Amino acid sequence: GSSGSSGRNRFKWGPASQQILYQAYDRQKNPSKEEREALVEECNRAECLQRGVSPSKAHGLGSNLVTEVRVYNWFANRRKEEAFRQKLAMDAYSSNSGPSSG
């Protein structure tokens, strides 16, 4: 499939890629096929440059290859964490109504 196939694997962002994600997230919290994509190619590209590799052979990155999914996950976590500090407040014994739990 085009930058998408059943086969979860351990992957870690890079020094350049990550930054790219932030620059995009700062503008749009929910990037669409267009927004996200711009990060899939941009990242894989910068990754090849910094790593000396070519931006036209990212396919090699393999475990270090970025795909619509990768960006989808990163953005998902960036939104889940920011809301966390607030989600943990909705619980009981807080400045808002909510059920008890321990």
Swiss-Prot record:
Gene (UniProt): HNF1B
Mutation effect (R51G): In RCAD; no impact on interaction with PCBD1; reduced coactivation by PCBD1
Domain of life: Eukaryota
Localisation per UniProt entry: Nucleus
DNA-binding region, residue range(s): 8-86
Family: Belongs to the HNF1 homeobox family.
Subunit structure: Binds DNA as a dimer. Can form homodimer or heterodimer with HNF1-alpha. Interacts (via HNF-p1 domain) with PCBD1; the interaction increases its transactivation activity.
Name of protein: Hepatocyte nuclear factor 1-beta
Protein role: Transcription factor that binds to the inverted palindrome 5'-GTTAATNATTAAC-3'. Binds to the FPC element in the cAMP regulatory unit of the PLAU gene. Transcriptional activity is increased by coactivator PCBD1.
Disease connection: Renal cysts and diabetes syndrome: An autosomal dominant disorder comprising non-diabetic renal disease resulting from abnormal renal development, and diabetes, which in some cases occurs earlier than age 25 years and is thus consistent with a diagnosis of maturity-onset diabetes of the young (MODY5). The renal disease is highly variable and includes renal cysts, glomerular tufts, aberrant nephrogenesis, primitive tubules, irregular collecting systems, oligomeganephronia, enlarged renal pelves, abnormal calyces, small kidney, single kidney, horseshoe kidney, and hyperuricemic nephropathy. Type 2 diabetes mellitus: A multifactorial disorder of glucose homeostasis caused by a lack of sensitivity to insulin. Affected individuals usually have an obese body habitus and manifestations of a metabolic syndrome characterized by diabetes, insulin resistance, hypertension and hypertriglyceridemia. The disease results in long-term complications that affect the eyes, kidneys, nerves, and blood vessels.
